[PDB]
Design a protein around this motif. Structure first.
Motif, PDB file in Angstrom:
ATOM      1  N   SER A  91      -2.820   6.277   1.481  1.00 14.36           N
ATOM      2  CA  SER A  91      -2.039   5.069   1.271  1.00 14.36           C
ATOM      3  C   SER A  91      -2.633   3.901   2.047  1.00 14.36           C
ATOM      4  N   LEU A  92      -3.084   4.149   3.278  1.00 14.51           N
ATOM      5  CA  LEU A  92      -3.652   3.087   4.097  1.00 14.51           C
ATOM      6  C   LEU A  92      -5.005   2.642   3.576  1.00 14.51           C
ATOM      7  N   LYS A 122       0.791  -1.223   0.000  1.00 12.91           N
ATOM      8  CA  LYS A 122       0.000   0.000   0.000  1.00 12.91           C
ATOM      9  C   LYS A 122       0.827   1.278   0.000  1.00 12.91           C
ATOM     10  N   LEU A 123       1.906   1.328   0.768  1.00  9.39           N
ATOM     11  CA  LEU A 123       2.601   2.598   0.994  1.00  9.39           C
ATOM     12  C   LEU A 123       3.679   2.828  -0.053  1.00  9.39           C
ATOM     13  N   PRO A 124       3.848   4.068  -0.515  1.00  6.34           N
ATOM     14  CA  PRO A 124       5.028   4.380  -1.331  1.00  6.34           C
ATOM     15  C   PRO A 124       6.288   4.104  -0.538  1.00  6.34           C
ATOM     16  N   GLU A 125       7.337   3.704  -1.252  1.00  2.00           N
ATOM     17  CA  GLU A 125       8.529   3.187  -0.586  1.00  2.00           C
ATOM     18  C   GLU A 125       9.156   4.206   0.353  1.00  2.00           C
ATOM     19  N   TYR A 126       9.045   5.503   0.053  1.00  2.00           N
ATOM     20  CA  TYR A 126       9.713   6.476   0.909  1.00  2.00           C
ATOM     21  C   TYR A 126       9.101   6.557   2.303  1.00  2.00           C
ATOM     22  N   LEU A 127       7.883   6.029   2.505  1.00  4.82           N
ATOM     23  CA  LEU A 127       7.282   6.023   3.836  1.00  4.82           C
ATOM     24  C   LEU A 127       7.889   4.941   4.734  1.00  4.82           C
TER      25      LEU A 127
END
Lengths: 107, 24, 105, 17
Positions: free
Chosen positions: A104-105, A78-83
């Protein structure tokens, strides 16, 4: 009173500050944020820190130790990698950050 | 049960290493 | 305490100013604002109270808003958000979201 | 800058009546 107020903020905004504290770098908050997707949660730290010139930076760190196995697989989808990285961003991005976690969630 | 209007899911927290024992 | 509210405002553009009790019940004074803009950018604010006597009462706070402020708010938010409402506390985040988006018009 | 924090300063009796 303050506990009731924190509970209202969670009902309103789906975010909870577990605690706040100051250290030698700045002001820190331990936070959980969630959204229905069935409720997906992300834990993270936000720090308000200043360099020598006193420009405030918001420091973000993901807190994965608060997640279950399946939740960690779900987050990775779900989350972009930078998170999953430590981030810095100005105060003016804080609502963008909030919305990014929430969207994202929800995915 | 954990809040004034019911149950708040963010107020419940995992203890990641509950069986930790710092020793030599 | 104060810094916690400051954090929620930065993050969510909402502020619980005060909580207090009356014969009717337990109440909270709330403001929600447009997300941060530039010097020339529009900024709208909606004030309302939330009451608890699980159901929550939504009571918009409008009487001290100028005619021009109310006209602008009524152009952005749906009409029901200018009436007193009662709905499940578990739905409150939906109204936070709707108000936040509406104020960003 | 916390606009809502300072909002109540522009209308102090906003929620009083």
């Amino acid at each position: 009173n303050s506990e009731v107020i924190k509970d209202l903020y969670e009902y309103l905004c789906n975010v909870r500050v577990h605690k706040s504290y100051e250290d030698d770098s700045g002001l820190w908050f331990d936070i959980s944020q969630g959204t229905h997707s069935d409720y997906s949660i992300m834990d993270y730290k936000l720090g308000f820190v200043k360099g020598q010139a006193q420009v405030t930076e918001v420091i973000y760190a993901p807190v994965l130790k608060q997640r279950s196995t399946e939740e960690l697989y779900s987050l990775q989808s779900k989350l972009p990698e930078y998170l999953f990285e430590t981030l810095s961003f100005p105060l003016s991005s804080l609502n963008q950050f909030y919305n990014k976690i929430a969207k994202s969630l929800n995915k | 049960s954990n809040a004034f209007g019911g149950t708040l899911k963010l107020k419940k927290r995992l203890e990641s290493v509950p069986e930790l024992f710092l020793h030599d």
